[PDB]
Amino acid sequence: MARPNPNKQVVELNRTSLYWGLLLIFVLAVLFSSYIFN
């Protein structure tokens, strides 16, 4: 087996990022569902 990978990194995102993401998904949903249902 190969040696441990040297350039291993971990992703992070703070509470502001979570709020931004949730608000984006919900806004896109409320905008587009009106047309999806048709």
Partner: peptide, 28 residues
């Protein structure tokens, strides 16, 4: 039943706004 879906989306969005207002992360 589409009305309930629309209302769910709206109230969910308002919930996100409320949490973003009152439950802010203290920076650093």
């Amino acid at each position: 039943m589409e009305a309930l879906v629309y209302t769910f989306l709206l109230v969910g969005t308002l919930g996100i706004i409320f949490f973003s207002i009152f439950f802010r992360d203290p920076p650093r």
